[PDB]
Amino acid sequence: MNTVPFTSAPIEVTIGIDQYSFNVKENQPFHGIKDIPIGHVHVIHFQHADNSSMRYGYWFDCRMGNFYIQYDPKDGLYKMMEERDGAKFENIVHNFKERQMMVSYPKIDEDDTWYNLTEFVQMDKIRKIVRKDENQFSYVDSSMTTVQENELSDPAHSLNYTVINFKSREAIRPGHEMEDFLDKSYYLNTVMLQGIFKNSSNYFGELQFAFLNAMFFGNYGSSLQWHAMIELICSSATVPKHMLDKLDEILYYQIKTLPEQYSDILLNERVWNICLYSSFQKNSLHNTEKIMENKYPELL
Amino acid sequence: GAMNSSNYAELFNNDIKLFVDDTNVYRVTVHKTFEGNVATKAINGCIFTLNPKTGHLFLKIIHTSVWAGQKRLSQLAKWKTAEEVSALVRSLPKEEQPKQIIVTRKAMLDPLEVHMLDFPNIAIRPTELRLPFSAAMSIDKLSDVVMKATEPQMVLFNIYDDWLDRISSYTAFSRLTLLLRALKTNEESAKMILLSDPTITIKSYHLWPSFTDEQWITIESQMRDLILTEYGRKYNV
Secondary structure, X not given: OEEEEEOOOOOOEEEEEOOEEEEEOOOOOOOEXXXXXXOOOEEEEEEEOOOOOOOEEEEEOHHHOEEEEEEEOOXXXXXXXXXXXXXXXXXXXXHHHHOOOOXXXXXXXXXXXXXHHHOOOOHHHHHHHOOOOOOOOEXXXXXXXXXXXXXXXXXXXXXXXXXXXXXXXXXOOOOOHHHHHHOOHHHHHHHHHHHHHOOHHHHHXXXXXXXXXXXXXXXXXXXXXXXXXXXXXXXXXXXXXXXHHHHHHHHHHHHHHOOHHHHHHHOOHHHHHHHHHHOOOOOOOHHHHHHHHHHOOOOO | OOEOOOOHHHHHOOOOEEEEEOXXXXXXXXXXXXXXXXXXXXXXXXXXXXXXXOOEEEEEEEOHHHHOOOOOHHHXXXXXXXXXXXXXXXXXXXXXXXXXXXXXXXXXXXXXXXHOOOOOOOEEEOEOOOOOHHHHHHOHHHHHHHHHOOOOEEEEEEOOOOHHHOOOHHHHHHHHHHHHHHHHHOHHHHHHHHHOOOOOOEOOOOOOEOOOHHHHHHHHHHHHHHHHHHHHHHHOO
């Protein structure tokens, strides 16, 4: 179990850790989150009491170093930072625990939710989507645009998701125009899986990462990317059996976890109705179809 | 964006553009089988691809053999239209390739877009106009060459005959679309009107009769009258 101390909490903010969150008052003596499960990525995020726009946060993995949060009054936000002095860091963490100024990451033992939502998310892959190689953790916010969004303006701050485009030369083999547009299996399996992602786990990892950024930050281009990578699978007639079964599990826990009040902007009606009901794989997402029908029958 | 009443004169500027109509590509007769089931028989069709400014018509005839052994023919028809239009563009010298292709039915957008991926600077547009080009097979000479064809075949025509020697492309297109609208709404009357007078003939190299200017005015008035009557009949107005 690992710990992310906070130097102080100078401004009123709502802090999230993974799917949990806490209200912290201006200069409340809050000094960190302990008992963070080792073995998964995590995300700490913020929403200031005074600006319910720009949700922001940091992806990290505690095996990669000792990380902590500090409010910067110049840039006006909570910043993640690494402590290189391991002794000095255990020292802070112990004193803050001794004084019990830390919240405990509130995992129910029965609950596999976070694992289910991050099964395939690797910290190394995140740092290739969010390129800032001097830090071991990754900053994301509501407003960051994707590389594909940009093509249709600042690259240092872009989400470098894999570009998927159903009407591109990449996607369509000359001479198989109709075949390949109607049946995306060659784009999925040859171009994306074997070519770019190399295997299904990296593909699933980007898909889950994109979902999480749409959920926690309302990042629109991430939503766009989640739905594209769903649609590519569902619009392919030939998909490995293990991927369909895993996809059905992946989506189930994503739909289960989504705030009910947000299904209007996070769920693209066309894509879901096509995936669940018209696509090649209409019959291969039984769990995802059952939770969608019982929880959001309006969108359908 | 979409072509509509507002941006109509764009059709006659000097940017090359083609209309593509696929309504007569996949053509069938429906009949009863010996066991009493229904079946279709395909007949020959055509892609109507037309430069509205110059009158040049690129009539690609679709021979019934194209369908042999294929399923979902109405969907395939759309892609074969897009294949053939894309081939036509490739076959034209660069300076002759269109800058825009306007499809008359929105279902052609995706097929044509996908087939023109090699031509990203050719814009593929839909239209809100209700153009009557489906009546193209009401023009005797076009129907004849389509139905006689024994193999795929591209036949070129000028759909305005020599009208442009005396009238603008705007006026020529308005005449074309009036004539075709009439033929669509009531072929028999429309055809009667065009041929009632045996002394006004069709040039071997033309599609329509060699009306004088004054006679075109009478013709057009008669077609307008035809169209209005049929409306009242349709809607009991």
